[PDB]
């Protein structure tokens, strides 16, 4: 019966709530209240990259920390050298509503997607030296929001149809599909060992997924509106989420509950992107009021501002050696801070 | 050296190509088409066009007096539209199609218009409004079986204005109903506030020929206002 199932769900949620309540013997703030603050943190722009004709929706650094890829709503995908500001490649697309990028960890492939519900895969190292489309992955029923390589032959995607999928490139068909969300899936993040990943999905919840066997292990709540960005702490045992209610939060995978909140009274606008630092001591977030804020991740205090853009900040990233930070926004410019 | 100069040469060739493509990008006008199930946006497409399953978006191209228009129509998505609409904030205009003869779903269209007018990322974009299927409305009004004031009680006291300019020979009842229905939209287009964007309403039928010319004229006015706000004359 429907009513008995609803009652049982309520009882199970009550038991889960009490079990989580038994574990809150302290808080992050009472313990870390004897740590010296990092101090004022100040950064300035070393490079400005010009050439896109419209908004910028995505970027992603290479694993050597020198090359990067970016996508615009002109209909182009550009690959840049960032020590000299030379252009290495400029690839034109079949559809101009592109919304994501990824760069393979080997350096041989790039991928993109958007409002055409298809994931396109481009080979960079061919015998003639030409970039031509290698693959077109089809089967979703809503726009593609994010995608990330695991290796040269496997990839993971999230769409606006409430699912996630794992694809095998050579054969061309899905191998596993992950279901359970109710609304659009907005962001996606991989674990350092690539055995687990987390998804944030525009219904105020986040989920932890097991790649090989294929079930949802844990579900995290606590926001009050949609979730736009997510990432992993370098340790691998925590993650951070940014919402449309003007708040960032920090969640732990072994205590199974919220751990920290970062918000301020003057900030009443949403969050577009989130990322961490190499040691994990700084958290960087980009906002809809055109600038980025730098937060202390163990004490929740604003310790810096990055302010050089004249429109909505849309993407943000940090290299694998920790040297630079890249930001891009709706005004067509990318900037590199150090 | 012997490599850095080659890198500079390659970057120069890429820049040449981008400078070639900029000219074509900045010379075409882009339009977004919105409608509903009972509206006739498909016949608008099928009339001005000649002039992979699970696909997310369709496009059509046409050209009037040597100006090029690209029109986009969304295909296979879901109902919720508050996330993929944000990526349409740079278009020249939004063409909004309404079915004007049904009386049961006009309030839903009014709510849609209110949401599109007042959104944060769509405040500078003008709307061209097509009130479709005039012949069905005229027949239904002449029938006398369904009353408008069962859905809009204010129609009980409305009277057609003394300064109006009707069509040559139309029965006054049809004129009164048409003027009332158009008023309903221009109110939410004047009470909204601001005053940067404008709405251009037309009445069209199921068999017509002049819609491309109308789009042409409205886009001319939009561009002139933009050029008047770009040269610091306001």
């Amino acid at each position, epitope marked *: 019966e429907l009513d008995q199932l609803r009652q049982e769900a309520e009882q199970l949620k009550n038991q889960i709530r009490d079990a989580r309540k038994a574990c809150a013997d302290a808080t992050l703030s009472q313990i870390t209240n004897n740590i010296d603050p990092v101090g004022r943190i100040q950064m300035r722009t070393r490079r400005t990259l010009r050439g896109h004709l419209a908004k910028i929706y995505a970027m992603h650094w290479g694993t050597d920390s020198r090359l990067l890829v970016s996508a615009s709503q002109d209909g182009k995908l550009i690959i840049w050298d960032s020590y000299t500001t030379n252009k290495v490649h400029a690839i034109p697309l079949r559809s101009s509503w592109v919304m994501t990028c990824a760069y393979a960890p080997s350096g041989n492939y790039v991928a993109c997607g958007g409002l055409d519900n298809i994931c396109s895969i481009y080979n960079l190292k061919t015998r003639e030296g030409n970039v031509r489309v290698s693959r077109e992955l089809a089967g979703h029923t809503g726009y593609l929001s994010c995608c990330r390589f695991l290796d040269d032959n496997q990839i993971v995607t999230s769409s606006g149809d409430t699912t996630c999928a794992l694809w095998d490139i050579e054969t061309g068909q899905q191998t596993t599909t992950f279901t359970g969300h109710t609304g659009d899936v907005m962001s996606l993040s991989l674990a350092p060992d690539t055995r687990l990943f987390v998804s944030g999905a525009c219904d*105020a919840s986040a989920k932890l997924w097991d790649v090989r066997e294929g079930m949802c292990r844990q579900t995290f709540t606590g926001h009050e509106s949609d979730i736009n960005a997510i990432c992993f702490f370098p340790n691998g045992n925590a993650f951070a989420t940014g919402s449309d209610d003007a708040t960032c939060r920090l969640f732990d995978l072994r205590a199974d509950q919220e751990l920290m909140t970062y918000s301020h009274d003057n900030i*009443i606008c949403g969050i577009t992107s989130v990322s961490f630092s190499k040691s994990g001591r700084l958290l960087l977030a980009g906002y809809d009021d055109f600038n980025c804020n730098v937060w202390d991740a163990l004490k929740a205090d604003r310790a810096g501002v990055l302010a050089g853009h004249d429109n909505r900040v849309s993407c943000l990233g940090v290299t694998d050696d920790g040297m630079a930070v890249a930001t891009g926004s709706w005004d067509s410019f990318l900037k590199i801070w150090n | 050296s012997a490599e850095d100069k080659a890198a500079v040469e390659r970057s120069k060739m890429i820049e040449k190509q981008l400078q070639k493509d900029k000219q074509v990008y900045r010379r075409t006008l882009r339009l977004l088409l919105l409608g509903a199930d009972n509206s006739g946006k498909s016949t608008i497409v099928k009339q001005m066009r000649i002039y992979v399953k699970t696909s997310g978006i369709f496009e059509t191209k046409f050209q009037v007096d040597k100006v090029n228009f690209h029109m986009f129509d969304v295909g296979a998505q*879901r*109902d919720e539209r*508050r996330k993929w609409i944000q990526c349409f904030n740079d278009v020249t205009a939004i063409i909004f199609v309404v079915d004007s003869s049904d009386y049961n779903r006009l309030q839903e269209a009014l709510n849609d218009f*209110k949401s599109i007018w007042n959104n944060r990322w769509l405040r500078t974009i003008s709307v061209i409004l097509f009130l479709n299927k005039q012949d069905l409305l005229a027949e239904k009004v002449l029938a006398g079986k369904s009353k408008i004031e069962d859905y809009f009680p204010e129609f009980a006291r409305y009277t057609t204005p003394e300064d109006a300019t009707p069509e040559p020979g139309e029965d006054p009842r049809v004129t009164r109903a048409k003027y009332f229905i158009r008023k309903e939209f221009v109110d939410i287009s004047t009470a909204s506030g601001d005053g940067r964007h404008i709405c251009y309403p037309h009445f069209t039928c199921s068999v017509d020929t002049e819609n491309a010319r109308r789009i042409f004229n409205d886009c001319k006015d939009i561009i002139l206002q933009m050029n008047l706000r770009e040269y610091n004359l306001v």
Partner: nanobody
Amino acid sequence: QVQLQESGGGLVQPGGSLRLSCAASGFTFSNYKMNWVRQAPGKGLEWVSDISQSGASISYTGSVKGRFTISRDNAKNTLYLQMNSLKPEDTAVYYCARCPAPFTRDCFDVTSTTYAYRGQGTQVTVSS
């Protein structure tokens, strides 16, 4: 956990009166604009009325003006609807809906595709 619980409902004879109420939990109630929607047998979701952040602006649909009234109580986080002079065409299920984001003035929330911030509903029958 965004939760919205409706109360009220039942069966009345034509011309009767009812009061529906909704209690909200899991967000800051006073930052949001609120709506009432309903669904009828054989129909889809229809929009009934809405109220603003403080109560200064109120709006109704053309078929209920003069009969239905809407109100907030921000100290108790409750939303109220008073229904008078009920007609047989008012038998339906009623839901309370919340806007997606705070501090805004537009809505996207009659979708059948499982809008997330909405309650389960309550039954209103007007027959004799």
